[PDB]
């Protein structure tokens, strides 16, 4: 079929459990891409489901701050997902290397995530697994764009309707409503932005225990803090935005629209 006839593979970029990602070129276009090549043979039932979902959901979204799916091909034992080429690695790896971000950069970064999140919510998509691992830098350049990735756990919603979509996501970034087993929707992604923003500024996360069942109580109680002295030189409008994102009640939590209009980002 048409991967062989349309595209040419080049170097290894990353390895998965059942997937490899390799730089490729749509030949008659001469445009380069990231081909995630997935051994469909090795995949389980729920793994297959997530792949179909990931392909349909990604294809709904077209935003500079979202890793675009351009194509989707199948070959008996392999599915090929043709994505944006991205050379800058994960935001996680960039936070460790740089340890924390200035308020300025932190603002410029969370800005792009929020716009991407806004597009998702405007397209009736909720990511559910927002974390620095799933936020990628376009290139090694010192102003490279941030793009949202891995929609394997993303879901479709009808307007502002909440429903029990299941327990899913990463413990550090799970919203209180998910953990309470309440119906949920768009606001979970804005909770995840709170935790990501908090990490950008001081370089460590607001919710952690070695004991997972205590971690989940810490999240549900809204039990985060701004310890002295490191937070004493952070601005109250930075903390204000965060407090609005880490609101326990999704109903009272700030939306992506509202957060983009926050002075800390607006100005």
């Amino acid at each position: 079929t048409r991967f062989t006839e349309e595209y040419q593979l080049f170097e290894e970029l990353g390895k998965g459990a059942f997937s490899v990602v390799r730089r490729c070129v749509k030949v008659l276009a001469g445009q380069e891409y990231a081909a995630k090549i997935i051994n469909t043979k090795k995949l389980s039932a729920r793994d297959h489901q997530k792949l179909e979902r990931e392909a349909r959901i990604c294809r709904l979204l077209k935003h500079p701050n979202i890793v675009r799916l351009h194509d989707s091909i199948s070959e008996e034992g392999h599915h090929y997902l043709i994505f944006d080429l991205v050379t800058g690695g994960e935001l996680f790896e960039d936070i460790v290397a740089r340890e924390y971000y200035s308020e300025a950069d932190a603002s410029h970064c969370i800005q792009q995530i929020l716009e991407a999140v806004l597009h998702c919510h405007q397209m009736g998509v909720v990511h559910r697994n927002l974390k620095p691992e799933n936020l990628l830098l376009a290139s090694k350049l010192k102003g490279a764009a941030v793009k949202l990735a891995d929609f394997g756990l993303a879901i479709e919603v009808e307007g502002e309707q909440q429903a029990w979509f299941g327990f899913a996501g990463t413990p550090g970034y799970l919203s209180p409503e998910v953990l309470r087993k309440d119906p949920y929707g768009k606001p979970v992604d804005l909770w995840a932005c709170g935790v990501i923003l908090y990490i950008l500024l001081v370089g460590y996360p607001p919710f952690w225990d070695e004991d997972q069942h205590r971690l989940y109580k810490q999240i549900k109680a809204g039990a985060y803090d701004f310890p002295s002295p490191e937070w004493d030189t952070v601005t109250p409008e930075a903390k204000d935005l965060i407090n609005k994102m880490l609101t326990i009640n999704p109903s009272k939590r700030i939306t992506a629209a509202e957060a983009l209009k926050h002075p800390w980002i607006s100005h």
Partner: peptide, 12 residues
Amino acid sequence: RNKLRRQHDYDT
């Protein structure tokens, strides 16, 4: 302070 670590996704 709390440590920042790579964390894995639940799917259930």
